[PDB]
């Protein structure tokens, strides 16, 4: 049974080095190219390069040439992907893959993938900003640069729940989170009713109430 | 290094046939070549569905077929069903090319379980408090669309903006339509240097746009 | 014409290490696999090993594997041989040589060689020779007489021998050295002279052994018996 | 009966040079291997991963017939796990090869009184050939400062040489036609079966 | 791999053919056609002469050819020339990217008439005896071809212990010379009536004799 087993998930800081691996079994390991493929979160497959473990002949994609080192240790049937200095843009799933046979070049065999997460992970409280309105009106709050999730958002101490939509946060390239919450209110009570969002973020122990007005 | 271009998304109802194109393929008649199609479900490794242009591995449903015409390959999925909802990647191999392998840009297939619904778009300006802090974030909120696949493009005076854009994956709302959000981070001077900014959302071949202006 | 120049040969004690170099002229070095080959005095060629043009592989004869290391620095057009754990039997002229064909080739041969560098592995101590006269025969008369000097028990090579400060060259043959079981070398020089010259012309061999900083000038007198 | 066209390979009027070896894909057909005797006089064969006596019973996904000429004393290099000037630079079988190598003396066809200089082989290469890799470059390798301009000479190395087969040579230096039959077995429907199956 | 077996020497006249064999095992010379030959002149680096059994690298005279049969390869030199006088080394691939050389063959091109050696046997010097050492020095000169065997006798009994002999060396006149030494204690020297150096050259023996009491 041709199997490709990759090393476990990696959580790294920016500027650190990393070496991940992919061990082959159940076939002649030195008779076949092995390829590496990157997939950034929510993006497509990118072919990075191949190595022939028999003689460590390597072919890098033009986009990865000089950006990563592919190597092989045939004595333990393993190939590797290595970075000298990780950048946040290296956050991705990484797969090794092998062609089906000597005559069928398509990638039939895949490793289970290694998740590489590059983060400036430090607990940090969010910055809150109001989003003022222009028969119906729309206003809300912006929750910026916090870690980790979650942030709980209320409105008028939880007395205004009909019409609120708190969006799932975006995971920025910095590792921080940022989300927005909006409420749809009747245009007649624009100047008659005061609207304040209540943002709570337990790990940083920060609570903010921000008023919204045109 | 030539791109294989696929549509960002295609959708169909259960039982229909859908087709995904893959344009830009080259080969070397003097070398080895292949065209492949891969299916990828969330959290899983890609799976080879079509190999050598038209062939299926054992166990791959014959609802999947592939073909090629000129420089364009096509995957067709007949009798579409919910389990087919996934990302699909075409790929070309040419032994003599640099790079020898290329993956296509990828296609999200949606299997429609309710009528299509266009997204609501709300574009908020940067906050004055944020402007006083000398940081600026444009907030583009997208809601009530179905199926859950959108493309988000930002324009500054009709000029595309690719730097500084963050976008979320679609998430199911309580009403079972989808929402997503996009943020554009800019310098305060960058905001003032252009007359207007636009958030353009493409969904099922139709575009919805909102626009923000410095004056208020 | 690429030129190859080996350097670094010297006298070294058993157990110690020595590094040889092989410098190539021009720019072609980086295209060629390179080899080391040695030859003990009076003996045959021995293939020692190889390193590929790009360093991709290195191969070694069993006789030096695990003792000698071959490497190259293409930025310096230079090939190296690191020799550890030296033994008497490593005493040899060491040659570097390039492959007949560039890139991976291997199956053809070695077409350009250096002039070689000499390595002597020995526990012997530097020692100047003892010089003894080889007196001409009293019977010699057979027209001409042979006489010479015996140059005994020196280390290392070489010694030079002249006769009468270089004034006498006709008839002179200076022999190659023998290496004795002592680890010390010996040789002889002989000259053929008219028998009538004996007892009127002085004959002195001048023996110079630079390694020991010794010169010996031995007068060779006719024997009465 | 839709027989696999082994005649196209074995009875080809002219064979390829080993450096530019030919490949015939064999799919969707009945493989009657018995026809090999009618085309290759006095052939010899070795099989790996298959027994020859059961070939008419087996089914494969695809078959490949690669064919070329080498000299007799190089036929042993066309085997898995071999190294040498042909295996390293001209045609390489993988260690895990599943198939058969068929070779037969073609002196009568491929030798000429003055030497057949049409059959060539590669002398040198930047790296060893991968399994079933094919290198048909003729570029003269420039080792020195002076450009070669397609002219061999000082520091300018031609990568290919002719065999020069002559009928006066011993068998080891006579030409042999070689067909390598690759039996590909994927987890996929078979398209090449023996006549018995 | 063991050294490949070659004959110690071969000889020929100008215009003749000369052959040199190179015998290996079934896992070097017998397994591969990668057999090469080198020529080496006195004091010079080897020169590449033959590869692939019978191919000549650029510039090598067409007079050099080769053949092989099983575990033995052959160098064949037609139209022998004076410049061909040299040592010849075969070499074979031995598997696993290892090469091995043969032991060498000394080829002589007969270029001058036979000349018998002059032999001079010196007894130990009085100065060396006073140092309590004794060396018998047998100097051999002006012979051609350059090959002799040297036998030492104490009285008339053969002596092998304490003998060192040099390989023949070319003199300025292009004839050859050699030297042989017999190292003795003064007691061994004085215990015999005589000592003899016997030089055999081209089947003929020349002898010189010294005695302790006879000077
Ligand atoms: C092979 O082909 C030649 C010419 O095409 C033909 O003359 C010969 O009969 C063929 N051999 C067979 C059919 O066995
Ligand atoms: Cl006695
Ligand atoms: Ni003389």
Author numbering:
A (entry chain I): 1 to 134, 141 to 220
B (entry chain M): 1 to 216
C (entry chain H): 1 to 140, 142 to 226
D (entry chain R): 333 to 529
E (entry chain L): 1 to 215
Verbatim from the authors:
Here, we describe a highly potent SARS-CoV-2 RBM-targeting mAb, designated VIR-7229, which has unprecedented activity across the entire family of sarbecoviruses. VIR-7229 recognizes an epitope in the RBD antigenic site Ia,28 which overlaps with the ACE2-binding site (i.e. the RBM), burying an average of 950 Å2 at the interface between the epitope and the paratope. VIR-7229 interacts with the RBD via polar interactions and shape complementarity mediated by all six CDR loops, with the heavy chain CDR3 (H3) dominating the paratope. VIR-7229 tolerates extraordinary epitope variability, partly attributed to its high binding affinity, receptor molecular mimicry, and interactions with RBM backbone atoms.
Moreover, we determined crystal structures of the VIR-7229 Fab fragment bound to XBB.1.5 and to EG.5 (XBB.1.5 + F456L) RBDs at 2.4 and 1.95 Å resolution, respectively, as well as of the parent S2V29 Fab bound to BQ.1.1 RBD at 1.67 Å resolution. Furthermore, comparison of the VIR-7229-bound XBB.1.5 and EG.5 structures shows that the VIR-7229 binding mode enables H3 to accommodate equally effectively F456 or L456 in these variant backgrounds, the latter mutation mediating immune evasion of many mAbs targeting antigenic site Ia. RBD structures (total simulation time 4.0 μs for each) indicated that residue 456 is one of the RBD positions (along with 415) with which VIR-7229 makes the largest number of persistent contacts for both F456 (XBB.1.5) and L456 (EG.5). Five out of 16 hydrogen bonds between VIR-7229 and the RBD involve RBD backbone rather than amino acid side chains (RBD residues N417, L455, R457, K458), which may contribute to the resilience of VIR-7229 to epitope diversification. VIR-7229 forms four hydrogen bonds with the backbone of residues 455, 457, and 458, whereas Omi-42 forms just one with backbone atoms in this RBD region. Conversely, VIR-7229 neutralizes XBB-descendant F456L variants and JN.1 with high potency, and the F456L-harboring JN.1.16 variant with moderate potency. Most VIR-7229 DMS escape mutations mapped to RBD position 456, which was the only position of escape for the BQ.1.1, XBB.1.5, EG.5, and BA.2.86 RBDs, with the exception of Y421W observed in the EG.5 background. Although the affinity maturation approach yielded candidate mAb sequences containing up to 11 mutations relative to the S2V29 mAb, one of the top neutralizers contained only two mutations (heavy chain V50Y and N57D) and was selected as the lead candidate (designated VIR-7229). S459P promoted full or partial escape from VIR-7229-mediated neutralization in early-Omicron (BA.2 and BA.5) but not in later-Omicron (BQ.1.1 and XBB.1.5) S backgrounds.
